[PDB]
Amino acid sequence: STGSATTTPIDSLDDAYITPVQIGTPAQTLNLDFDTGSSDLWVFSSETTASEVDGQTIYTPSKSTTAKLLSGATWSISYGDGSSSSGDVYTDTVSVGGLTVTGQAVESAKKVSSSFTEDSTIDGLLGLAFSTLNTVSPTQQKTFFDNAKASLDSPVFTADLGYHAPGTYNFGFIDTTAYTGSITYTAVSTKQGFWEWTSTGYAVGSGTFKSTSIDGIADTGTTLLYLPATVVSAYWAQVSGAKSSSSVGGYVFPCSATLPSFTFGVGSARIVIPGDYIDFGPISTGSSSCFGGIQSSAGIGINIFGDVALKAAFVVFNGATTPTLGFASK
Numbered sequence: 001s002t003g004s005a006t007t008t009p010i011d012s013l014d015d016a017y018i019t020p021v022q023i024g025t026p027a028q029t030l031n032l033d034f035d036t037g038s039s040d041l042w043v044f045s046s047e048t049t050a051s052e053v054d055g056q057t058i059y060t061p062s063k064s065t066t067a068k069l070l071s072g073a074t075w076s077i078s079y080g081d082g083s084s085s086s087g088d089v090y091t092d093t094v095s096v097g098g099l100t101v102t103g104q105a106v107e108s109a110k111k112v113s114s115s116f117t118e119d120s121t122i123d124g125l126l127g128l129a130f131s132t133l134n135t136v137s138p139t140q141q142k143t144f145f146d147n148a149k150a151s152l153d154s155p156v157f158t159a160d161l162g163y164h165a166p167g168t169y170n171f172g173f174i175d176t177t178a179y180t181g182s183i184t185y186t187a188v189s190t191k192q193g194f195w196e197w198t199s200t201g202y203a204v205g206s207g208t209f210k211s212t213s214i215d216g217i218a219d220t221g222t223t224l225l226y227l228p229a230t231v232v233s234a235y236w237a238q239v240s241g242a243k244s245s246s247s248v249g250g251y252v253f254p255c256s257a258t259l260p261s262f263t264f265g266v267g268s269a270r271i272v273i274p275g276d277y278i279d280f281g282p283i284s285t286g287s288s289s290c291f292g293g294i295q296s297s298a299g300i301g302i303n304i305f306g307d308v309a310l311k312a313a314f315v316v317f318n319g320a321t322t323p324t325l326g327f328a329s330k
Contacts, residue, residue: 001100001148002171003099004168005168006166007169010121012164014164017034017307021096022094022095023059023106024067028059028060028063029057030044032124033125034128034221036129036195036217036218037217041094042106045060046062047110048108048112049110054118066093067091069089070139073089073137073138083114084112084113086110087110089106094106097169107141128145129194130143132193133194151172156318159317161310179328185267188323195219196216196302199214199265200213202264203270204238204260205261209265214227214303215303216297216303216305218310220307220310225305225306225308226300227303236253236292239259239260241253242254250296251291254289255281256288259275259276264305264309271309273312277311278308279293313327313329314330
């Protein structure tokens with residue numbers, strides 16, 4: 001089997017991407033944030049505290065003839081941005097782009113933190129990291145990809161995120177029309193539950209490439225590119241007037257700037273992030289100070305190849321017995 005679904009930016013900045021997902025019988029379509037940095041499929045629901053729902057579409061398990069309470073199971077998750085959610089668990093039929101999993105754990109939120117409530121466009125998350133990170137207790141549950149893998153034509157999914165435009169998540173096949181050149185594959189460590197890999201270095205603009213190992217995670221659920229402070233300083237030093245602002249919470253730059261590109265290495269190959277991808281717009285409405293899309297990972301404890309980096313590539317998440325990652329230009 002295969003599946004193919006379009007993923008759409010939630011706003012003009014590409015702050016996140018939403019992908020329609022069918023849950024239950026008859027189908028209830030929710031727009032979920034596909035997140036290769038976590039492993040829970042959770043949704044706003046008829047159980048979510050009413051004051052914490054503000055415009056989201058909810059899953060109502062009582063209206064699904066295939067929903068079954070997973071008795072005794074609870075979940076609770078906290079994300080790197082400080083947001084969180086928790087609740088109980090149903091199993092139900094879940095389909096993405098024509099690919100169907102029966103018996104998928106659908107984690108129903110009883111509580112969500114303010115940032116989820118305040119974002120009316122995201123109805124929940126669909127985790128695509130390794131199932132060892134799934135938070136369901138006392139019986140850990142499998143991700144949608146883990147459940148589907150054996151049925152797929154090939155044990156892979158791909159992320160093709162757009163810059164200010166829709167893109168595609170494919171399951172079970174590699175669309176050879178969706179990228180240029182060849183795909184360069186690179187090793188993955190699953191020891192922390194992430195799609196963790198080692199970039200071979202970087203360049204700023206037209207500058208020379210610096211060969212240096214940068215361990216980090218391919219994380220579709222993180223907006224920005226978070227790298228060591230040395231790398232990030234070298235980038236922003238090429239932008240007149242850019243500075244790190246403790247009050248704003250990262251590097252800012254004059255909105256009048258033209259940003260340089262940023263290149264990262266995948267083995268001997270190179271992925272180029274155009275400068276425009278690194279502009280996240282005014283820090284507050286009408287400000288001439290703009291927020292940078294490359295920020296320091298110092299204090300986060302891991303480097304994060306978020307959407308800013310991934311959207312510059314066609315990315316293969318290879319779930320073969322020994323997982324690997326593939327990157328191609330596009």
